[PDB]
Amino acid sequence: GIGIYSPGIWRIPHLEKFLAQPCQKLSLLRPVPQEVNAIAVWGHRPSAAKPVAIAKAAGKPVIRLEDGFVRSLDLGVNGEPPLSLVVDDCGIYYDASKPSALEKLVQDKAGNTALISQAREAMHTIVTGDMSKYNLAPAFVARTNIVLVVDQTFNNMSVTYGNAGPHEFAAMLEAAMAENPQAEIWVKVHPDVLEGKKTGYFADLRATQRVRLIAENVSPQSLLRHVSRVYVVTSQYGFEALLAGKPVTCFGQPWYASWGLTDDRHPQSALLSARRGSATLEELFAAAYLRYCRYIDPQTGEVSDLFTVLQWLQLQ
Ligand SMILES: Nc1ccn([C@@H]2O[C@H](COP(=O)(O)O)[C@@H](O)[C@H]2O)c(=O)n1
Ligand SMILES: O=C(O)[C@@]1(O)C[C@@H](O)[C@@H](O)[C@@H]([C@H](O)CO)O1
Ligand SMILES: [Cl-]
């Protein structure tokens, strides 16, 4: 029932197990069939624009896909298939300009309360089992007052649609340095940049004695254990820091900002917080990791759950 134009999407292994619905390939060169009840695209990739306009003009709704928050062993830039996808029938999680399906799941508190025991169980497995979106980095080993500043991939869609850009990165690091005069500043490069497939926002940062550059691929939770507080623009690292029990200052508008849990600096923070309301950490985790994300079994490709994928990711 769902039409897909993107060959890249069409090509995702076990895609049909993620969508839980029949899917069919559509061509831009002919009308959308009436049978199609929705059109699915990848986030806001440039390829999504033409299918979005088509769907609008035929009155069909758009579904936006993206990788899950526990995705795979190696990076997507290296061609590793995903073990989790998100499926968003309202917007997409990283677009702060309007509600996403994730935002409405967070606000459905009753539905998150029903999952609190699974959420606590999975949260513990992630923090003490040292898990993250990617899971091939080795644990970190090595002053005690450390401020973590998180770099990202240049022009990533979670920055642009989270109302940020190069300025918020410069402002983030100047704020980190100025608000913690005696702390040591640690700038973590994104693994895609370390893989040489992307560039960072601090490409031309000059390191000092107080500003140390961490250009090593290390697992988030292990590095977080040595940090006092975290500064982000929009990175998923920010939510993982909250799971580690660390304070988080946000300079863009990611999916986990403006719920009452983060020190939000974006100029439109008050507007977004008014729309979102309040939420607990466990509500956010249940909504995002258990309800918004879908999983497949890594050995069979059949529909699965977070716990099965966490288990299979942990022995490697
Ligand atoms: N500076 C950074 C930024 C991201 N990452 C990794 O990349 C994942 C995704 O983060 P992004 O939203 O920044 O793409 C994180 O969960 C984390 O595993 C990292 O290890 N160091
Ligand atoms: O259409 C896509 O977006 C694509 O083919 C390219 C990348 O998004 C890449 O992540 C790929 C993965 O197979 C999905 O994670 O999907
Ligand atoms: Cl369980």
Residue numbers in the entry: 1 to 142, 147 to 320
Please share text taken word for word from the publication where this structure appeared.
To identify a more stable KpsC-NEc-Kdo adduct, an Asp160Asn variant was analyzed. However, as both a worse nucleophile and a worse leaving group, we rationalized that the resulting Kdo–Asn160 adduct would be significantly more recalcitrant to hydrolysis, allowing this intermediate species to accumulate. To determine the structure of the observed KpsC-NEc Kdo adduct, crystals of KpsC-NEc D160N were grown in the presence of 1 mM CMP before being briefly soaked in a CMP-Kdo–generating reaction mixture and then immediately frozen. In the resulting map, clear density was visible for the CMP nucleotide, which refined to an occupancy of 0.95. Additional density was associated with Asn160; this density was modeled as an α-Kdo adduct and refined to a final occupancy of 0.76, with atomic displacement parameters (B-factors) similar to surrounding residues. This adduct was modeled as being linked to the Oγ of Asn160. Finally, a less defined density peak stacked on Trp42 was modeled as a Kdo residue with partial occupancy (0.78). The α-Kdo adduct is stabilized in the active site by an extensive network of hydrogen bond interactions, mediated by a series of highly conserved residues. The observed binding mode places the exocyclic O7 and O8 nearest the CMP phosphate group, while the anomeric carbon is positioned 5.4 Å away. Nevertheless, the distance between the anomeric carbon and the CMP phosphate suggests that the adduct undergoes significant structural rearrangement after transfer of Kdo from CMP.
KpsC is a dual-module glycosyltransferase (GT) essential for “group 2” capsular polysaccharide biosynthesis in Escherichia coli and other Gram-negative pathogens. Two separate GT modules in KpsC transfer 3-deoxy-β-d-manno-oct-2-ulosonic acid (β-Kdo) from cytidine-5′-monophospho-β-Kdo donor to a glycolipid acceptor. The N-terminal and C-terminal modules add alternating Kdo residues with β-(2→4) and β-(2→7) linkages, respectively, generating a conserved oligosaccharide core that is further glycosylated to produce diverse capsule structures. Based on the formation of covalent adducts with Kdo identified here by mass spectrometry and X-ray crystallography, we determined that catalytically important active site residues are conserved in WbbB and KpsC, suggesting a shared double-displacement mechanism.
